[model samples]
Target: MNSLIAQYPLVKDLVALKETTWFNPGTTSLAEGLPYVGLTEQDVQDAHARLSRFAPYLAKAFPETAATGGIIESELVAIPAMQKRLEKEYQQPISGQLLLKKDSHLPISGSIKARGGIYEVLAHAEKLALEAGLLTLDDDYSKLLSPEFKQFFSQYSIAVGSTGNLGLSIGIMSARIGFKVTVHMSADARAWKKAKLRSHGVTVVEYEQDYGVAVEEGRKAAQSDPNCFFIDDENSRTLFLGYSVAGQRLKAQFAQQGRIVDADNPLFVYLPCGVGGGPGGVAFGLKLAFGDHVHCFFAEPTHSPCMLLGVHTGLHDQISVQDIGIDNLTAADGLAVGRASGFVGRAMERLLDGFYTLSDQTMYDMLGWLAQEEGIRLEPSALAGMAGPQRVCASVSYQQMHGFSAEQLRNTTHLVWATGGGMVPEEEMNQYLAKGR
Candidate 1:
């Protein structure tokens, strides 16, 4: 550990809980990184197809998804005002357009978890129904809304451990589908999240420890119950594939808007990462879609940069921020993870271009700025990626290493993935705004 600090000066900053960035010198071309991913574009397509098959059922289950035929997705909004505010404040001259991927406003659970969490539950439900001979591919999925289907589903149970957002998504979707769902939440999880799950008739198990402990307990509970299926955030391929579907959807969106992504016009996406499933899956999908033209980075809270620490130290889940004396506590509850998912960290080590950390204050400040500048409200955790463009624009070394000329830099598109906050009560939002001010 002492040798690690001496070898990587960034480790010293990380241990001290300072904001920093670490560009992956090991970053490989998309082709070179593909083998490490294990899963391919076909896996993403399968996840996409499964979601489509469940669309009718989702529309019938959740009214908010009716318009999209039960497809859970967000908007790629151009946040010019917010971009201008960032450039002026950070004093970093950002070229090209800055866009916001508004997963924060996604329907159902109102967070990015609405994608993977909901999709995984649906996939499990479909599998059970199919095995029971109660459903067939040719049948309308909306038939699952019947009392018989619900009764059959109630016989099985689903479980997961989460800090906040993921629990909300899984609990809501699972309970709505008549599965006996239990969300084991860490101390960092918001009280409102637990209340919301309870409102949906889902069991909420509270843990006094952190995310890891909650996950362990959840796994144990599932192991004891024959009918209980646990959704593992750290290593679930199903959840990973569920999130990867975003890549093709984003590509289609860009095409519809006539946006170009190539060597001449590169796309840089910054995603806020917790255990790494959401961002890692999305980055893999983006790589598959755009090939060598898309660069992805993960953002974390300074107090809990577990993924960065894991990758930089080559320790993966074997290490924890707490082991280095840094408390895994942050206002960004979803990002308050001590250890990174080893599966995601190892698989994405070559694919990810970089990782960075920001202070909770910076996230809060950006939360207020985005609200004022773009009339958009987001949780503090969602604002973690907002600082990404500034960091990238200021990094001359990174630009040179990539051979990005002035023209290419000017044409680069920066997309910040906002991960949550649409479901926050107005009173909670006011408190956040007051803290930001």
Candidate 2:
């Protein structure tokens, strides 16, 4: 190691991650590559079924989403304007089209957590209700809102740790069902997020530690309470399965829009990653749906690239951002994670195409550009995927190594997963917008 990076061997990797956006193609397979894992597409479908069964209940509980029949799916928006801006900004040609997975506008928690986070809590509720002989598949789920149901649910509790969004999702869902919920929040969580949880009747536990410690402590607390279930962001299979439900829906959206993702007409999805569960589960579902047709990549902030570092070195969860001397701090509060989830890393490493990093400056810039160019606004963490296309397009070596021709590239469909911000207060949003400018 050089003098500058001697004490910190991964200092070079950390610095290079921010020097410029770049692509690091993965080298593994979805089949026979993942060890110690056995989740299947049916599992994802089961999750969808459970949520569908609870639609009536959700609509009654969250009136804001009642118009959509209580479904929490977001929009798939075409953004030729912002895509063109990006092409010019990087001077890297884009051969095909660009779209946005508007998870930012998702109802309830206004983030991707509206998917996995809500689903996990609902699944827990369903399990307890069924086991208690209170719910059947044929029963109207809206009945869950009855005082009888609420009183029954009061016997249980839900707890989890999050940088911000996951806590919002779990807290809101758990509280609505009369389950006592506590959110263990990391230091990076925004004040507005903490306030929102408090308003929802959820207990907020403050922690000066990073995401890893908060999660570790939350899990430890739940272990002591037999009736308290912890949403383990790092190792929960339910969370991963809940997120995987999006893959099937995404394929339907593509079909509705007359988009075909074949070998020649490829689909490329870029997702902003934190501890890796959200992106990993979604990628797993996409792979199951599209097989070899869809390519998934995770984008992380340069200040906290735990997923990238873990995957790049094949160390999985053994290493953390702190291990490499990275501060793991960023304006993207939901993404301020110190370590990647080992379960996700080892399970999805073979399924993922790659991971990349971007600076907070780039995220803020893209957040502003998306709002200005397409009238779409997102949180800082949500903007990470906006830089992915440039990284892939500018990598001539990557193209050559993969035999990516201009025609194939031109026929590609790039989708940036906009993760959150639908619930940001106007004041906070104004501050974010001003920072972007």
Candidate 3:
């Protein structure tokens, strides 16, 4: 026990991150934090514009993405039954409405990666096309399907490393647009994900190591190739910007639902995090959209709580979960990142509210409840957000630390960002569902 304590002293409660849960409140604010960051609201806005301009292209290329007026967005749903079940299971009460972002059922790549990953590839393609004078902003981007543009894009290549979902997005989009794409994946990736990418004609690179190793390898390989662009998961401001676009869309989503977010009625968001870019970028956007009224927390698998450990210790990216003797393994494979992104951690540390860790068993349990109670299906990683409402509502010390009252809590909106699972094969989903049973 002493040895384990010595090893994971930086983990939750300073011991046994596996069985324990923790909450760490924010230490800084957006006004105090944004000045130190490189990206800004304008950057996020520009990314949104780029996506807007490509709406027609997305509509033409992937009809599945066309359902929401050809924009890549998900549903915001109220799952009261699931909420009640979770509250009962947590032995805690929920004061406000419990909502799900439903990114798990998001179109295209079927996960939260569908946001930044596809956006990253599309952004790269735009840059290349614009540089070659093969495309212009006013032109119908769907025209890129022409052989002339496809041949031009064929000259360049794009590469990314992921556990599964990110690679799916990058590979599918890059290959569809005629860029020779390579996906370097870690050992944790599901076999179906690899098969799907290969079926799309994307080259798959396998690594015996974890997400960090595959990422480093992809970076070095890109560094060696003049025509290859590496979608760096750790430090890509473009991916960050791509993700930040969700903020405005979400604001509009709330408006449509007649949900008001102001100082009196705050918005509490829970995002499942991996290497930090996805959640950090999205959190940055939410802060910009809602300002002081919005509070964001990152939830992670206890076995791979790299962001929680890094933020807790103020080490940022200097440390990995393995550095503190954590195994960095979990059923939430997409959340099994060892290291947090230093760029994102430092940039948005002040903008975020807190961090927490949960068990894999809890994720599976939530997965089952969501499926059975609401007909909502998601991967285990996506279920990480399921813990946030109870975690936040039960934290009196945290509320005191953040100056939130019971009245304020009751008025707040709690939204859990379900990260991914829309594209899971039936057999694999059956296996996961069976585990829950």
* Model 2 C-alpha lDDT per residue in residues 142-163, reported as the tens digit of each score: 9999999999999999988764
Location of the lowest summed lDDT over 10 successive residues in candidate 1 = 209-218
lDDT of 3 at 230: 83
Q: Which candidate do you rate higher for TM-score, 2 or 3?
A: 3
Query: For every model shown, what is its TM-score relative to the native structure?
Result: 0.97, 0.93, 0.94
CA lDDT, every model vs. true structure: 0.89, 0.84, 0.84
Deviation (Å) of 221 in candidate 3: 2.9
Residue 429 lDDT in candidate 2: 82
Task: Please write out the lDDT profile of model 1 over residues 1-437, one tens digit for every residue.
Answer: 67778886788999887889888888898888889888988888989888888888888789888999888889999999998888888888878999999999989988888988888898999999999999998889999999999999999999877657888999999999999998887665667877899999999987675656657766986788899998888888888888888899999999998999999999999999999999999998899999889999999999999999999989999988888888988989878888898599988889898999999999999999999999899998899999999888899988988889999999999999999989998988988898874
Model 2 local distance difference test score: 0.84
Residues 138-195, candidate 3, lDDT per residue (tens digit)? 9889998888877988899888776578889899999988999888876556788889
Query: What is the full ranking by TM-score, best candidate first?
Result: 1, 3, 2
Clash pairs, candidate 1, are none
Q: Over 4 Å off in model 2, which ranges?
A: 1-11, 15-37, 186-189, 207-215
Clashes of each: 0, 1, 0
lDDT at 156, model 2: 96
In candidate 2, which residue pairs clash? 95-410
